Amino acid sequence: VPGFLQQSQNSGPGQPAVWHRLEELYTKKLWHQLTLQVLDFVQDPCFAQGDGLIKLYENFISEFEHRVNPLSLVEIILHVVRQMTDPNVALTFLEKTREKVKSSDEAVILCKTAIGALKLNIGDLQVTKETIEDVEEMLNNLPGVTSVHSRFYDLSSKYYQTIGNHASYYKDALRFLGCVDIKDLPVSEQQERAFTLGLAGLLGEGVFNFGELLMHPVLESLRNTDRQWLIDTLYAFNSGNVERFQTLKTAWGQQPDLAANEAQLLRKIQLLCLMEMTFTRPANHRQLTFEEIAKSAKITVNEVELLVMKALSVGLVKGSIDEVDKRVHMTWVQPRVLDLQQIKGMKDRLEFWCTDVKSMEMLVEHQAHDILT
Amino acid sequence: AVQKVVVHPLVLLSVVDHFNRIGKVGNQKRVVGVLLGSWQKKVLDVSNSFAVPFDEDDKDDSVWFLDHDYLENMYGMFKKVNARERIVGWYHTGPKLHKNDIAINELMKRYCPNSVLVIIDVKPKDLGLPTEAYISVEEVHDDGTPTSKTFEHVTSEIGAEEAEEVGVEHLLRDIKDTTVGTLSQRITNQVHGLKGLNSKLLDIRSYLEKVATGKLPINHQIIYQLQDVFNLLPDVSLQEFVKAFYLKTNDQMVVV
Amino acid sequence: KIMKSEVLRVTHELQAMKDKIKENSEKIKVNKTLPYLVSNVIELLDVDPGKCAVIKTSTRQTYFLPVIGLVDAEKLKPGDLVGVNKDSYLILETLPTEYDSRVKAMEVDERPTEQYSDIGGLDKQIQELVEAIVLPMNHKEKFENLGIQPPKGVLMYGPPGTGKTLLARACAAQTKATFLKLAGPQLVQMFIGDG
Amino acid sequence: CTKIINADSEDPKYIINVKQFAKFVVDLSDQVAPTDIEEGMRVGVDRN
Amino acid sequence: KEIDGRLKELREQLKELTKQYEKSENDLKALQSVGQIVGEVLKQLTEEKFIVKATNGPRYVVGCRRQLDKSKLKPGTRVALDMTTLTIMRYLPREVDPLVYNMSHEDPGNVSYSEIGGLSEQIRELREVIELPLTNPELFQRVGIIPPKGCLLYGPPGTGKTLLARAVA
Amino acid sequence: AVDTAEQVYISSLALLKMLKHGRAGVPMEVMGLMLGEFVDDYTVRVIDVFAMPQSGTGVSVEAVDPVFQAKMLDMLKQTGRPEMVVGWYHSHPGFGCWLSGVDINTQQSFEALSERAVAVVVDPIQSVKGKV
Amino acid sequence: MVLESTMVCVDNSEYMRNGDFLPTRLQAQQDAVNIVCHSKTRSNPENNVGLITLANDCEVLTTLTPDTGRILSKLHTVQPKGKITFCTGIRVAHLALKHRQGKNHKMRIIAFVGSPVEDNEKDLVKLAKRLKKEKVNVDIINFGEEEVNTEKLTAFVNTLNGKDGTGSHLVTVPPGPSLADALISSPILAG
Numbered sequence A: 001v002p003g004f005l006q007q008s009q010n011s012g013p014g015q016p017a018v019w020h021r022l023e024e025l026y027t028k029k030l031w032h033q034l035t036l037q038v039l040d041f042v043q044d045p046c047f048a049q050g051d052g053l054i055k056l057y058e059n060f061i062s063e064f065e066h067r068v069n070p071l072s073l074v075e076i077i078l079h080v081v082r083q084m085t086d087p088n089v090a091l092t093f094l095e096k097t098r099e100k101v102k103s104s105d106e107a108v109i110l111c112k113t114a115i116g117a118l119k120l121n122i123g124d125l126q127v128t129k130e131t132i133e134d135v136e137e138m139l140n141n142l143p144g145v146t147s148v149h150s151r152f153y154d155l156s157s158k159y160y161q162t163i164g165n166h167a168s169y170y171k172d173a174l175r176f177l178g179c180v181d182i183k184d185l186p187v188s189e190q191q192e193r194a195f196t197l198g199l200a201g202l203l204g205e206g207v208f209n210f211g212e213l214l215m216h217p218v219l220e221s222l223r224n225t226d227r228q229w230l231i232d233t234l235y236a237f238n239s240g241n242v243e244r245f246q247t248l249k250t251a252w253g254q255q256p257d258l259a260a261n262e263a264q265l266l267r268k269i270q271l272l273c274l275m276e277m278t279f280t281r282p283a284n285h286r287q288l289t290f291e292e293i294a295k296s297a298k299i300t301v302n303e304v305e306l307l308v309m310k311a312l313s314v315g316l317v318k319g320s321i322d323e324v325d326k327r328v329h330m331t332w333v334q335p336r337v338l339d340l341q342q343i344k345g346m347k348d349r350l351e352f353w354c355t356d357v358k359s360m361e362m363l364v365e366h367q368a369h370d371i372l373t
Numbered sequence B: 001a002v003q004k005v006v007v008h009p010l011v012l013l014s015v016v017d018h019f020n021r022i023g024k025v026g027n028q029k030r031v032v033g034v035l036l037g038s039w040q041k042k043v044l045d046v047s048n049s050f051a052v053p054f055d056e057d058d059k060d061d062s063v064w065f066l067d068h069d070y071l072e073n074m075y076g077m078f079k080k081v082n083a084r085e086r087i088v089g090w091y092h093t094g095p096k097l098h099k100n101d102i103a104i105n106e107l108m109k110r111y112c113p114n115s116v117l118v119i120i121d122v123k124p125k126d127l128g129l130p131t132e133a134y135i136s137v138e139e140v141h142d143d144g145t146p147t148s149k150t151f152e153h154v155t156s157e158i159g160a161e162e163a164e165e166v167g168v169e170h171l172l173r174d175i176k177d178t179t180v181g182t183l184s185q186r187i188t189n190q191v192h193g194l195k196g197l198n199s200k201l202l203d204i205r206s207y208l209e210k211v212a213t214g215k216l217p218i219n220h221q222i223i224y225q226l227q228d229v230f231n232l233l234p235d236v237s238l239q240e241f242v243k244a245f246y247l248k249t250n251d252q253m254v255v256v
Numbered sequence C: 001k002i003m004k005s006e007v008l009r010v011t012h013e014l015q016a017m018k019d020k021i022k023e024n025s026e027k028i029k030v031n032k033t034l035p036y037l038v039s040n041v042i043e044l045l046d047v048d049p050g051k052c053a054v055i056k057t058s059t060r061q062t063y064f065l066p067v068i069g070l071v072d073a074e075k076l077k078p079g080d081l082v083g084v085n086k087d088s089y090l091i092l093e094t095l096p097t098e099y100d101s102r103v104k105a106m107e108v109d110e111r112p113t114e115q116y117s118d119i120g121g122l123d124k125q126i127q128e129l130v131e132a133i134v135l136p137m138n139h140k141e142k143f144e145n146l147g148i149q150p151p152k153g154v155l156m157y158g159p160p161g162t163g164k165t166l167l168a169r170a171c172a173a174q175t176k177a178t179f180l181k182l183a184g185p186q187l188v189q190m191f192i193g194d195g
Numbered sequence D: 001c002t003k004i005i006n007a008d009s010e011d012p013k014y015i016i017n018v019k020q021f022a023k024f025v026v027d028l029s030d031q032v033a034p035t036d037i038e039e040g041m042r043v044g045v046d047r048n
Numbered sequence E: 001k002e003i004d005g006r007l008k009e010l011r012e013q014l015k016e017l018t019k020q021y022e023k024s025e026n027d028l029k030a031l032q033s034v035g036q037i038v039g040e041v042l043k044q045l046t047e048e049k050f051i052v053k054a055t056n057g058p059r060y061v062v063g064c065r066r067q068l069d070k071s072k073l074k075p076g077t078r079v080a081l082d083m084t085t086l087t088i089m090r091y092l093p094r095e096v097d098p099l100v101y102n103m104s105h106e107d108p109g110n111v112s113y114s115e116i117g118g119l120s121e122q123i124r125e126l127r128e129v130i131e132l133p134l135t136n137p138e139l140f141q142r143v144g145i146i147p148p149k150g151c152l153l154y155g156p157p158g159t160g161k162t163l164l165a166r167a168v169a
Numbered sequence F: 001a002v003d004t005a006e007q008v009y010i011s012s013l014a015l016l017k018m019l020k021h022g023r024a025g026v027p028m029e030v031m032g033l034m035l036g037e038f039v040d041d042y043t044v045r046v047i048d049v050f051a052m053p054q055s056g057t058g059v060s061v062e063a064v065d066p067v068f069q070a071k072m073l074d075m076l077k078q079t080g081r082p083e084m085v086v087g088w089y090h091s092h093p094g095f096g097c098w099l100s101g102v103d104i105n106t107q108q109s110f111e112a113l114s115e116r117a118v119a120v121v122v123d124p125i126q127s128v129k130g131k132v
Numbered sequence G: 001m002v003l004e005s006t007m008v009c010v011d012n013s014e015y016m017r018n019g020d021f022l023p024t025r026l027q028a029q030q031d032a033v034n035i036v037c038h039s040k041t042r043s044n045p046e047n048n049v050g051l052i053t054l055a056n057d058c059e060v061l062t063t064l065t066p067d068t069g070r071i072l073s074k075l076h077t078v079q080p081k082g083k084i085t086f087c088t089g090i091r092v093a094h095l096a097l098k099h100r101q102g103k104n105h106k107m108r109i110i111a112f113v114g115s116p117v118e119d120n121e122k123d124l125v126k127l128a129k130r131l132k133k134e135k136v137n138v139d140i141i142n143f144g145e146e147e148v149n150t151e152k153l154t155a156f157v158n159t160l161n162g163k164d165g166t167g168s169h170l171v172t173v174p175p176g177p178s179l180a181d182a183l184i185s186s187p188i189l190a191g
């Protein structure tokens, strides 16, 4: 160990000061503070070009002290494992890290995520589906660790470019956005992440509400400077606004992953342009005539049957559908964002109900003074 | 994990007396103990109570003490005299909940896996609420929101303990809280029913107004998901009264 | 390693475990020291949605103690005369049954003292049945290891006064086991099924 | 009430048939030794 | 190893053992267990009133309080009553003739029915009276008849009747 | 030797413990002691009462375990409010407002220990709708 | 006889499982706990010693009791992964030992510290002043590597033993190895 310390004091400016700290730490038998020093050196402004050499040094130190912090060591040495960049032996490297630390802490599950990430990079058929599913299967009795949860959210968000998960991939991407609040990475990449999530909602079918991303400031402010037409389109999907010209400009604004599914964009916006009538009018206008449908969705007469059919299937409107008068009864069982800036409308309706109830209560009291007085 | 809880009319007064008897020297306003009972069919019930002196400091809400050996001895004695009784949760007064609850729940959950919190308003009798139930859920606040504590309220209803009807009738023997005097009593039933509806719905209107002002954090992600359907449910259509013009008016005219 | 923690639990968890049944047994053995209701077991194999029982009490009552809370039904086979709680109305403990009035002690001699030396004359026959009866008692394990189950029914026929009764009692004394005598000529009972 | 006794265990316990049809056993009263009481003899029992 | 092997002894002695504290509680639970009186509901007086005969004493009437599933209770069902709790706290199915049960469920290990010779005609008589009606009711359905009920065996005291009865048992 | 028109300020929770304990141990004639204090000669007040499992022996003084009672009293002193023992309660399904011979004997022992040790008869089975 | 009621608060920080002492510092502090509890037991077997934690929690299950095995069992596998909360730890030790106990029993709180602490000087000085007003008797023993007898600890002890107080000392231990006998030599009979 003293010989390795003497050799390790070289190969970097400012390193021997940390190496002297490392010498003091194992002299007094410190492991947690050693991991912080290892964390500081790895996150030092250097590329860690000697990835193999530092891997040997770190494994040398850990194996002759055998009392380091397990979860944080794997969180740090994983950077070296990824940087070595050889998947055929990287799988063996992850098995070696699993064997060196086989506890049920964050170490093993992080190793599983590293296995899944490697399978994305090369060999996207071996164990990809089993790995991603098993991460959630193993996050049991772990409500708020939030460390590997963010890891699992990141892999599955990068798994959006895979047949297995599109809507769920967007959901866990939102989960990543919630669990990690600070930016902690360039705004441009977050704006790209917002672009991918926006395309995920547009291409998806079951994402009718798709909440926490429509008017979310954390997602919109990333693209507040570029491609604001994406911000408007999501607001159109949220509040039921049609803006068919703008939404068509959305279709060919970001050509990849949108040109083929622009028809699905047509159906979803026609599906979601009726909700604005649904919550604004609490059965006040319960006659959804064909002309009213035409105003709301700018759709033909034959497509109304399919649109209201899909509305009943998803859960937008569940009322009776006639054709002699073409009247659609209004029940909604799938609420979504109601534009909290416009909460005055529901507040006014609620206070209208309060005034009516109190007035009738006083009226029946007036009719009942002959008993209650 | 429990579907709902049901509180007996058996422990509410016992907790209040325990608050009164141990508040003589402890003016912390904070009374903390454990509620014992049984959970059988996704319905949790409380059958016994116990209070422990408990002091707090506002500094990060981490200054406290209990008598755990005495409390554990109580549980063994209670289980020995009645095996079916088990600690269903731990209770704290002072409905303005502080931050030590997470530390208390972590310590006491070794007695009950689904640890729950109970708040008893000894002095407050706001409308009719004797106590409130709380469930600990920290499994991510929501799909796209940051981490939080988020202690939710599992639905609680006052149950009907057996053999206590004799005692409560003998105790009060003055108000006769029953359907006695059917016409007048139902009038009183209609009176405070309107009073309760007006008070609670006014509170909902105030919450909507305060959300509009934005002075408080907005929990919209469940507020509009639960109130939108409430608003849009078509109970205002009068054409079903047209279809049912004789909804009962025939029974009204025969009774005449 | 991890022994000293395990057994400091184990020996403590052994002795405290056994002490509470010592308390409990007492708490139920005084009840078992005061049973009052005969056990006319009318069984149900009530598998819990294991078993259960109905007890016709002495005072003409019936008590359905759930799943038979104290005694296994393997040993608690149905019948009568098995301990029942007077207060808890539960099966307490097995106890000897009633031996059908006459059979309780009809002519049962506890132990005969007549010896084989005082009888004789038919020594070949008496030795023959000793090998077929007495040896299956003393050296019963010899037949068990051999694999041949000894015969049981020995019919001793001959005019009266040939010493059959002494020989049977002498053989029983040699076996040092229970001897039961049946008054055959008087087993013809007018009561139906009495014999 | 007074009833006969049936039998007993090795010494302490006494399995008894009672005129109330009772499968009755009791710890014999401290004033009465087990030697005096014999099988088939009538003994009074205190109801408590 | 001394700290290893001395462990492996002490916990095994228990496992099945040290299973007493709860056995003690269960029999203490029995000690304060209420013994609920048992009767047969002769008939249902009303939807909440049920006329029940105590197996020995008089017919009482009781009433399920909130959730005892009064619909499943039938005239002649078995329920538990208490002269104090006034109601049925739980319901109970029936009986099985216990004395008969064990003496009919203690058939000793026998040999196959093929181990007795000269009674193959009797063997096939037993097959076409027991096995045939239950295996193939479709043939008898085309026949349209009920299967036969019983068969009698008689003769010298030594035939193999006990062997055949024990073999079919 | 002075016993005027004495009155008991029994508490509602003491009643609830009585009915719960009686409802649990219905046919067993379960025993207990009424935790009260003689603030003066005749204005006795009972604020709390506890439930104890009757031993298998039956109604006996040793059934109320002295060590268990002492530990229970210490637990009440540490958590709750201490209270003296000057009474006892017993669910009495057998017959009414009187005491059995063994109940009289154990009450005599209680009277020797305490100053009065009132003999309280509570019938758990007769109290059904209106009269406890 | 003058009897002593001692409440120990043990540092279950993230560093305590390191091998600065032979097994660990956590076990070394556990060995510090049972020897002083043994000394209390030898003085009188009914001397009571209780456990307090400060790793973002306050362990009360092991109450102020004479038995030592419960301390050994419950403190073992304490999972020393959390942080240190010095201000809360001693204070809750005061409340826990403030519980029902004999007036003859001399109230004393003992603290074991083995890891560096990051707490505000102002907050701990405020606690020291508050404990000075409350007349609290606490002695603190250090172990292993730390900024041992730091300015906060020295002022905290000085407030609690000054003004003609008990005179409880805090020892400046060498980092790593330490002599537990020399650490507890003074307060076991003087302070």
Ligand SMILES: Nc1ncnc2c1ncn2[C@@H]1O[C@H](COP(=O)(O)OP(=O)(O)O)[C@@H](O)[C@H]1O
Pocket (backbone or CB within 6 Å): C118, C119, C120, C121, C158, C159, C160, C161, C162, C163, C164, C165, C166
């Ligand atoms: N071999 C014998 N040795 C001694 N006594 C005998 C012998 N054979 C018969 N006895 C006498 O005969 C009597 C038994 O008569 P009993 O049992 O009626 O004859 P059996 O057994 O032939 O029917 C005995 O009292 C006994 O004294």
Ligand SMILES: Nc1ncnc2c1ncn2[C@@H]1O[C@H](COP(=O)(O)OP(=O)(O)O)[C@@H](O)[C@H]1O
Pocket (backbone or CB within 6 Å): E115, E116, E117, E118, E156, E157, E158, E159, E160, E161, E162, E163, E164
């Ligand atoms: N046909 C047979 N085949 C084989 N063994 C027989 C036969 N008949 C009688 N036995 C013998 O007789 C004994 C069975 O008695 P059994 O004759 O079945 O009584 P029962 O005729 O009253 O039914 C057995 O030991 C058996 O070996």
